[PDB]
């Protein structure tokens with residue numbers, strides 16, 4: 001018995017065709033217009049190339065989708081089409097197929113990304129506020145469109161640190177939120193999984209992404225990346241509990257009637273909730289204000305309902321310097 005505090009009924013209030021992705025029929029253009037230039041990465045579901053559209057010389061990124069149920073392809077395509085024009089969401093330029101093999105691929109705008117491992121050690125206080133605000137715009141947008149990203153992490157946040165451009169990428173795990181629906185907890189990267197996933201609570205919502213966002217904020221202001229570095233999914237919860245506290249975890253479980261896998265009994269131990277100021281030291285002190293800590297405390301909460309929404313986070317005083325600059 002849990003529902004999102006925002007955008008709970010937004011899919012219910014739209015035409016079924018909006019969210020019934022299995023019924024979506026994409027228009028597949030011709031991949032022969034694109035010349036692959038360089039491999040940028042590979043995952044379990046895709047490989048990604050920098051490319052050039054030979055008809056107009058536009059530099060793009062082509063994500064060639066590996067064999068999966070056509071259902072997952074339709075889901076990602078329909079989600080991207082629903083997100084068209086959204087602020088700081090990667091722009092889908094076209095949906096194309098190899099005209100012979102019919103292998104599908106997604107064509108995105110190019111971003112000249114700086115890998116987060118370099119970047120996150122040289123950000124200023126203002127830079128962190130700026131990039132977190134930009135990422136929040138993308139999450140508020142997709143949540144408002146009834147979509148949970150479910151894989152927020154640095155590797156899915158492309159940042160051009162020269163042009164100050166940020167895009168949220170890889171919508172292949174994203175889903176439509178419907179109240180009371182049970183979702184697969186095998187989403188997100190280990191380090192960015194919310195406690196709800198780690199305790200097998202399936203009735204989660206957009207607030208999962210706000211946990212992941214909080215993990216990114218913590219890594220930036222404190223310079224510990226990833227912030228919660230579990231060795232496996234069990235140890236991931238232990239790492240969280242050593243900060244947020246074990247009695248506090250048990251109160252969350254009790255509230256939502258969550259059953260705890262008994263393997264945790266041997267590993268959680270007993271831990272008091274820690275003050276966020278404990279993470280400050282000389283190397284990160286210039287990034288950590290009272291506002292940053294207040295915001296972080298309101299994101300990295302066990303209780304998914306009590307976490308700030310993306311909009312509430314955007315409204316927090318931590319971002320006032322950014323809003324003032326963007327006005």
Ligand SMILES: OCCCn1nnc2c(Br)c(Br)c(Br)c(Br)c21
Pocket residue numbers: 040041048061063090108109110111112113154155156158169170
């Ligand atoms: O962390 C992932 C790095 C490789 N990678 N994978 N998907 C990408 C998309 Br789409 C864009 Br656009 C850009 Br630029 C890059 Br690079 C991408």
Ligand SMILES: [Cl-]
Pocket residue numbers: 175182183184
């Ligand atoms: Cl699911």
Ligand SMILES: [Cl-]
Pocket residue numbers: 242243
């Ligand atoms: Cl710690």
Ligand code: NA
Pocket residue numbers: 197198199200260261
């Ligand atoms: Na569990």
